[PDB]
Ligand binder design. Structure first.
Ligand SMILES: C=C(/C=C\C[C@@H](O)[C@@H](O)[C@H](O)C/C=C/C=C\[C@@H](O)C[C@@H]1O[C@H](C[C@@H](O)[C@H](O)C[C@H]2O[C@H]([C@H](O)[C@H](O)CC[C@H](O)/C=C/[C@H](C)[C@@H](O)C[C@]3(O)O[C@H](C[C@@H](O)CCCCCCC[C@@]45C[C@@H](C)C[C@@](C)(O4)[C@@H](C[C@@H](C)CCCCC[C@@H](O)[C@H](O)[C@H](O)[C@@H](O)[C@H](O)[C@H]4O[C@H](C[C@H](O)[C@H](O)/C(C)=C/[C@H](O)C[C@@H](C)[C@H](O)C(=O)N/C=C/C(=O)NCCCO)[C@H](O)[C@@H](O)[C@@H]4O)O5)[C@H](O)[C@@H](O)[C@H]3O)C[C@@H](O)[C@@H]2O)[C@@H](O)[C@H](O)[C@H]1O)CC[C@H](O)[C@@H](O)[C@H](O)[C@H](C)C[C@H]1O[C@H](/C=C\[C@@H](O)[C@H](O)C[C@@H]2C[C@@H]3C[C@H](O2)[C@@H](CC[C@H]2O[C@H](CN)C[C@H]2O)O3)[C@@H](O)[C@H](O)[C@H]1O
Ligand SMILES: CCCCCCCC/C=C\CCCCCCCC(=O)OC[C@H](COP(=O)(O)OCC[N+](C)(C)C)OC(=O)CCCCCCC/C=C\CCCCCCCC
Ligand SMILES: CCCCCCCC/C=C\CCCCCCCC(=O)OC[C@H](COP(=O)(O)OCC[N+](C)(C)C)OC(=O)CCCCCCC/C=C\CCCCCCCC
Ligand SMILES: CCCCCCCC/C=C\CCCCCCCC(=O)OC[C@H](COP(=O)(O)OCC[N+](C)(C)C)OC(=O)CCCCCCC/C=C\CCCCCCCC
Ligand SMILES: CCCCCCCC/C=C\CCCCCCCC(=O)OC[C@H](COP(=O)(O)OCC[N+](C)(C)C)OC(=O)CCCCCCC/C=C\CCCCCCCC
Ligand SMILES: CCCCCCCC/C=C\CCCCCCCC(=O)OC[C@H](COP(=O)(O)OCC[N+](C)(C)C)OC(=O)CCCCCCC/C=C\CCCCCCCC
Ligand SMILES: CCCCCCCC/C=C\CCCCCCCC(=O)OC[C@H](COP(=O)(O)OCC[N+](C)(C)C)OC(=O)CCCCCCC/C=C\CCCCCCCC
Ligand SMILES: CC(C)CCC[C@@H](C)[C@H]1CC[C@H]2[C@@H]3CC=C4C[C@@H](O)CC[C@]4(C)[C@H]3CC[C@]12C
Ligand SMILES: CC(C)CCC[C@@H](C)[C@H]1CC[C@H]2[C@@H]3CC=C4C[C@@H](O)CC[C@]4(C)[C@H]3CC[C@]12C
Ligand SMILES: CC(C)CCC[C@@H](C)[C@H]1CC[C@H]2[C@@H]3CC=C4C[C@@H](O)CC[C@]4(C)[C@H]3CC[C@]12C
Ligand SMILES: CC(C)CCC[C@@H](C)[C@H]1CC[C@H]2[C@@H]3CC=C4C[C@@H](O)CC[C@]4(C)[C@H]3CC[C@]12C
Ligand code: NA
Ligand code: NA
Lengths: 294, 49, 244, 49, 40, 294, 40
């Protein structure tokens, strides 16, 4: 048993058979798995063919666009002490990582960046979704536009003295045209003043009615001084057709924030092709928990 | 021996764990999710059937 | 024993290759209860192949029920094919929604992070957390259907081990009942309005149902030839190796 | 008898997947979670019934 | 293809569900008919 | 044109293209025709598998059996002069070719030839259509049984003095059991006398009523002296299972044949599983035109 | 398989012709229906 089944020397067997059998079974399995691999690779190549390089075949899942933010907060909470410097480092590292892509050195020369209206404007169409007129051109977005949250004056961006900033950003979607609400009698209260048609408004508030009083002055920084996104940076043509493309950003400073207390702040964008979802808490709006404990 | 044997025991655990996952959620977080409650309601039905 | 391979391979590539999970818990439970309960029971009721009395008796010492050949056919040959069949539907769903195959190796770490709402796909778009989880669930449902489709073939080839199905015939009614019923279970769970909230299955588009068809025909044709060679050459290599 | 052999193969693979996990950097806990899941997925269920 | 290209972001899931349910019901009926033909 | 299209030396072109193109097209056609050949060979191998080696899958076309004869007459006419020897050479060569297979030297030893009843007998079943009991055994058929047409005494077989012979033969069919007509009140006139159940009768006559008188004495030679085929040489098991098998033969001497006149003689076999056809003039019966012009 | 194995030499060509004709007539009808649907 023990020995005879492992190796016998009369029939010249290992594990139960001689050798020729092992050679035939091994050869068969090698050829079989080779045919299987080849067929799988061919059926996957036909699929790599079917699709187009400039446009995803289905765009119903990423619509409408979301609303992400920097810093990178886990559980949507921004808690840091004004004394211990090693408390807001994970936040500043992220904020810096995001703003580090808008350096003027990167946006240099005529290509592939072109100058655009310093004031909000309308859409700009650079053609169809082809390779005919080569790489398209994207509008420049300067860092300095964000006034007190730019990392150029106060690298920390505010976390140093109990005045934090939040750089909001709209999710990039190919061929998506933002449509703001019109001046008709039906419009939220907030949006009435400064109705620049060319700007998509973003406005933050308090989740609960009580927290209203505990929240101070929400100071929005953006293109032209408005609290929104200029329509001129749309639409987006995709990575392949618009490499080196920069999406607008909006800075939000939560000045006069009550100390030692968790505040729930909900920011929300408004527009026609903008819709929220009770399941996805990042579709169009976003929630942040701020607690400047010092 | 049928509903509480040797392989179904592990499923009984899956169900327990998931229910605790929903309790800590509803007690703590405002407006929670429900994938855990339905996961428990499904697992229990499997052991029973 | 054949369905074991497609349920384990996803958890293997997921951990090793670091890709999004192809099969989940609810979908796996659906596979076990659907394609393995009724079709299996139907097999018991099968009729006898002509050959039953035209074959020598058996020596219990030399011929056992579970020998090294059953695992060869189920795990090794048929199984790996059902696994490839499900992987194709998975790759197709992702490629069409924007995520290609080359970019998928390593996205798990980032994919499973509820906090990165900025996930970027191949075409450069930025995806939130539930927007990408929805596509992953559409892959779970497709995998499930690809499994039922390949099961069709596995079940048909299981009716006979020496004769063809053209010889044996499709006179078993319970087996037919099983084929129609399983297909119905998959269509019902994928299209019903509310499974989304409760079971986490999403509707499947029409061009996807067919992804598993080539792998379903290959299994049937392979077994048919595998048998012709047996009938013609007794005591050959095929009978020594694959006849269970 | 068969069930016994398979159980042996399964327990072995469990410990193996364990070394692969720790040589790849997971958490001591994740390796035992994998060992438990793999051994449960390799043993067949239903044969005697 | 112009600003009002909203169709590129819409899908008729309703019709798909209706057809899928019709098919499911038909297949299930066929099954019952075959399983019970004769009362045995 | 003439020269430029054949060979130009600036673009290095032959017949119209350079070379790389010829290489790509030739390589493509080679690979393509290789895939085509391989697929055809595989689909033909599956067919070579399907069939059995001991039995044709369909036996409805060769049934019932025909009735062939030696000599080999073209247009079913046997015309030869009794004086010129170079007139019946083509016939004797054929007759000899047929009888040359019944030489006793070939039927020697115990295998695979066994002795059978010298008098007509019943069928003999050597088993099923398998390879279990190896090569079956066939009954011996001696040349001498044919008395005056054997090529052993008068090599010419009769053509030398205006008395020809015709060796009739029944077409070999696998698993075919000959069934003669029974003794019931319904039976042809001729068959009544010498009703040996074990013998399949063969009887020749004149096509037209007039020719009757011009035809002489039809003398049949066969096994046991009867004008038929003994049932013991059936059934036939096929070449693979019964190599070295000899089928019975029946000699017919047309003695007293009128000189210098075309005579139409029709020979016919009788039996249950025997049926004639108005289209095939060789199914069960046969026609011969004899004219011994001297 | 015994002397009375005459079945091995018989074929039911009659039934085959009947079915072939039924099919031919059906296919031809389908064709006419499709070609003339609408009177144009
Ligand atoms: C029900 C089950 C059980 C659980 C189910 C579970 O899922 C769920 O129910 C959930 O529980 C739900 C429950 C919820 C409960 C409550 C919740 O509701 C409520 C909420 O929960 C939330 C949490 C929740 O949100 C969570 O997230 C859930 C997840 O949890 C898991 C997480 O991941 C993870 O736990 C996160 C938690 C946390 O992270 C834990 C950390 C650790 C505890 C610990 O570290 C922390 C800490 O330190 O612990 C301290 C306590 C200490 O006393 C402990 C002592 C430690 C002992 C140390 C010894 C280690 C050891 C051990 C030895 C044996 C070997 C050895 C090698 O290592 C040896 C060596 C020594 C020498 C090492 C010494 C190290 C020293 C360490 C210690 O000292 C301590 O660390 C130290 O003291 C510390 O204090 C100190 O700080 C130290 O820090 C550092 C230490 C390091 O960190 C650490 O050491 C590290 C890194 C080690 C690294 O390994 C090192 C490596 C790099 C390596 O070395 C390396 O370099 N390699 C380099 C290689 C290299 O270069 N190579 C180069 C190559 C060159 O060639 C530092 O270094 C040190 O120095 C320092 O000292 O010794 C102390 O407390 C603290 O300190 C603490 O911090 C994960 C899950 O559990 C869960 O999802 C809460 O946040 C929330 O607040 C609460 O409200 C069964 C499971 C199922 O069966 C299974 O299916 C399972 O479900 C799947 C598997 C899931 C997977 O798939 C899922 C999707 C689908 C699945 O479901 C599918 O189903 C899968 C299926 C499975 C199978 C197969 C197939 O697929 C299917 C087929 C089946 C089919 O077939 C069937 C047929 N039968 C039919 C059909 O079914 O079934 C996925 O979704 C899953 O994600 C996925 O996982
Ligand atoms: C929407 C979903 C539709 C799904 C369609 C699925 C179609 C089927 C897929 C492939 C079929 C081809 C498989 C052929 C494999 C060889 C089978 C073989 O070799 O069987 C051998 C048997 C002979 O047995 P025996 O003489 O020993 O029996 C003796 C009986 N005793 C003992 C009573 C005398 O032969 C027989 O039974 C005769 C049976 C002949 C059947 C011929 C079928 C082939 C015709 C077309 C195939 C398709 C080609 C490509 C199609 C692509 C489609 C888009
Ligand atoms: C687009 C491409 C897709 C390719 C995917 C491949 C899928 C799988 C591939 C092939 C599987 C299907 C093969 C069907 C085989 C039919 C064979 C047949 O026809 O053999 C004729 C038999 C023989 O008759 P006999 O009297 O000589 O037997 C005498 C028996 N003795 C001797 C014991 C008395 O006749 C009988 O069995 C009686 C009549 C039975 C008629 C059965 C019809 C139902 C067949 C399948 C049902 C569909 C299941 C799928 C459900 C999903 C739908 C949504
Ligand atoms: C054979 C075993 C194999 C498989 C076994 C699986 C075991 C599973 C056992 C139980 C699972 C129970 C699943 C419960 C079904 C859903 C219940 C539920 O929790 O629903 C919640 C939803 C509410 O969602 P929401 O408000 O968030 O949507 C917002 C939509 N927005 C925002 C886009 C407009 O309710 C709705 O949507 C309203 C829709 C209600 C759905 C009615 C469907 C009826 C469900 C089952 C009956 C079918 C039995 C089969 C009978 C066969 C007869 C031959
Ligand atoms: C999406 C695609 C759908 C369709 C895919 C179809 C795939 C299936 C095609 C073939 C099935 C492969 C089966 C593998 C079995 C081969 C094993 C073999 O090698 O067994 C050889 C045996 C020898 O037995 P022995 O006893 O003498 O061994 C004595 C050994 N000692 C000497 C050591 C004792 O048999 C012989 O040599 C003679 C018998 C040779 C049989 C060749 C059968 C070829 C039939 C079909 C292939 C053509 C398909 C064309 C389709 C084109 C697709 C693009
Ligand atoms: C023995 C065999 C007997 C068989 C007899 C069958 C008789 C025929 C009975 C039904 C035939 C089909 C009926 C068609 C109506 C289906 C209702 C439907 O099309 O609903 C669709 C909508 C879902 O909303 P949405 O797509 O806009 O969501 C957004 C989608 N997103 C999230 C992807 C964006 O529904 C809604 O809103 C409201 C939904 C209200 C509740 C619908 C109930 C559906 C559940 C079960 C009924 C089907 C039973 C089939 C039985 C098969 C046997 C296995
Ligand atoms: C606008 C579209 C309008 C369409 C309306 C169609 C209405 C339906 C009309 C006919 C439907 C099918 C009728 C079935 C009867 C067929 C007759 C039949 O089964 O005959 C078989 C026997 C043949 O003898 P056997 O097999 O024993 O020979 C020995 C065989 N061996 C030599 C191989 C041994 O017949 C005999 O003996 C006697 C034969 C007597 C004459 C039969 C006439 C057949 C010729 C034409 C009729 C079919 C027209 C179909 C129109 C299609 C449109 C393109
Ligand atoms: C056993 C048989 C049926 C397997 C046949 C496998 C065929 C489909 C496989 C074998 C090798 C494969 C090729 C390998 C490499 C490339 C280069 C790539 O840039 C395009 C696809 C292409 C050209 C593949 C196409 C599919 C292919 C030809
Ligand atoms: C195996 C053989 C005999 C039958 C094969 C049946 C296949 C082709 C059937 C089984 C179930 C069917 C699906 C059932 C439901 C739907 C949803 C509908 O909105 C589009 C068609 C689609 C996707 C069907 C396509 C055809 C389908 C996949
Ligand atoms: C391009 C692809 C699809 C062509 C594949 C061709 C396959 C079907 C061909 C290529 C070579 C062929 C083999 C060549 C030689 C033999 C030996 C013979 O005694 C049995 C058939 C066998 C084993 C053939 C089977 C069919 C075969 C394997
Ligand atoms: C091409 C697709 C869409 C349809 C294919 C139709 C094929 C399968 C149809 C066309 C004509 C049909 C044949 C028409 C007549 C007969 C004679 C009958 O006694 C046996 C069946 C047989 C031999 C049919 C078999 C099926 C057949 C070959
Ligand atoms: Na299983
Ligand atoms: Na199981």
């Amino acid at each position: 048993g023990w020995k005879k089944f492992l190796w016998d020397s009369e029939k010249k067997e290992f594990l139960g058979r001689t050798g020729s059998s092992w050679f035939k079974i091994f050869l068969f399995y090698l050829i079989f798995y080779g045919c299987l691999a080849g067929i799988f690779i061919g059926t996957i190549q036909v699929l790599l063919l079917t699709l187009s390089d400039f446009e995803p075949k289905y765009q119903d899942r990423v619509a409408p666009p979301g609303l992400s933010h920097a810093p990178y907060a886990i559980k949507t909470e921004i808690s840091f002490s004004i004394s211990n410097p090693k408390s807001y480092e994970s936040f500043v590292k992220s904020m810096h990582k995001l703003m580090d892509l808008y350096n003027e050195s990167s946006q240099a020369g005529n290509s592939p960046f072109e100058d655009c209206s310093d004031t909000p404007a309308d859409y700009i169409k650079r053609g169809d979704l082809d390779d005919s007129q080569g790489q398209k051109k994207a509008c420049r977005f300067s860092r300095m536009w964000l006034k007190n949250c730019s990392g150029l004056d106060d690298t920390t961006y505010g976390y140093a003295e109990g005045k934090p900033c939040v750089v909001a950003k709209l999710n990039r979607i190919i061929g998506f045209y933002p449509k703001p609400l019109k001046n008709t009698t039906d419009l939220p209260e907030e949006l009435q003043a400064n109705y620049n048609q060319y700007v998509l408004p973003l406005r933050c508030a308090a989740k609960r009615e009580e927290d209203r009083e505990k929240i101070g002055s929400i100071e929005y920084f953006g293109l032209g001084g408005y609290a929104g996104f200029p329509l001129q940076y749309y639409p987006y043509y995709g990575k392949r057709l618009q490499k080196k493309y920069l999406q607008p950003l909006l800075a939000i400073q939560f000045t006069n924030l009550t100390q030692n207390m968790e505040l729930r702040i909900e920011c929300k964008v408004y527009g026609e092709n903008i819709d929220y979802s009770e399941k996805d808490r990042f579709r169009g709006r976003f929630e942040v928990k701020i607690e400047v404990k010092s | 021996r049928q509903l509480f044997g040797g392989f179904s025991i592990l499923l009984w655990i899956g169900a327990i764990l998931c229910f605790l996952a929903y309790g800590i959620q509803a007690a703590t977080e405002d407006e929670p999710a429900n994938d855990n409650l339905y996961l428990g309601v499904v697992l229990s039905t499997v052991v029973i059937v | 024993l054949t369905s074991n391979i497609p349920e384990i391979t996803p958890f293997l590539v997921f951990i090793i290759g670091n890709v999004p999970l192809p099969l989940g818990t609810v979908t796996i439970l659906c596979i076990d209860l659907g394609t393995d309960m009724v079709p299996a029971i139907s097999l018991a009721y099968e009729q006898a192949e002509s050959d039953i009395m035209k074959r020598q008796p058996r020596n219990p010492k030399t011929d056992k029920l579970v020998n090294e050949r059953l695992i060869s056919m189920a795990y090794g040959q048929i199984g790996m094919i059902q696994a490839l069949g499900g992987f194709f539907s998975y790759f197709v769903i992702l490629a069409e929604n924007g995520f290609l195959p080359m970019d998928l190796i390593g996205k798990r770490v980032r994919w499973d992070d509820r906090w990165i709402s900025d996930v970027e796909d191949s075409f450069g778009q930025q995806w939130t957390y539930e927007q990408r989880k929805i596509v992953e669930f559409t892959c779970h449902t497709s995998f499930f259907i690809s499994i039922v489709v390949v099961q069709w073939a596995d079940l048909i080839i299981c009716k006979t081990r020496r004769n063809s199905i053209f010889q044996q015939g499709m006179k078993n009614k319970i087996l037919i009942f099983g084929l129609f019923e399983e297909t119905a279970l998959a269509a019902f769970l994928s299209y019903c309005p509310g499974t989304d909230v409760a079971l986490r299955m999403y509707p499947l588009k029409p061009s996807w149902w067919f992804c598993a068809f080539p792998y379903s025909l290959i299994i049937f044709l392979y077994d048919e030839m595998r048998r012709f060679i047996i009938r013609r050459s007794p005591g050959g290599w095929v009978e020594q190796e694959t006849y269970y | 008898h068969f069930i016994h052999i398979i159980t042996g193969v399964a327990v072995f693979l469990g410990v193996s997947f364990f070394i692969l996990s720790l040589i790849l950097g997971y958490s001591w806990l994740e390796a035992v979670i994998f060992l438990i899941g793999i051994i449960v997925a390799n043993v067949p269920e239903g044969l005697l019934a | 293809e112009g600003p009002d290209n909203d169709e590129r972001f819409t899908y008729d899931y309703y019709r798909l569900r209706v057809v899928g349910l019709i098919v499911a019901a038909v297949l299930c009926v066929i099954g019952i008919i075959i399983l019970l033909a004769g009362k045995c």
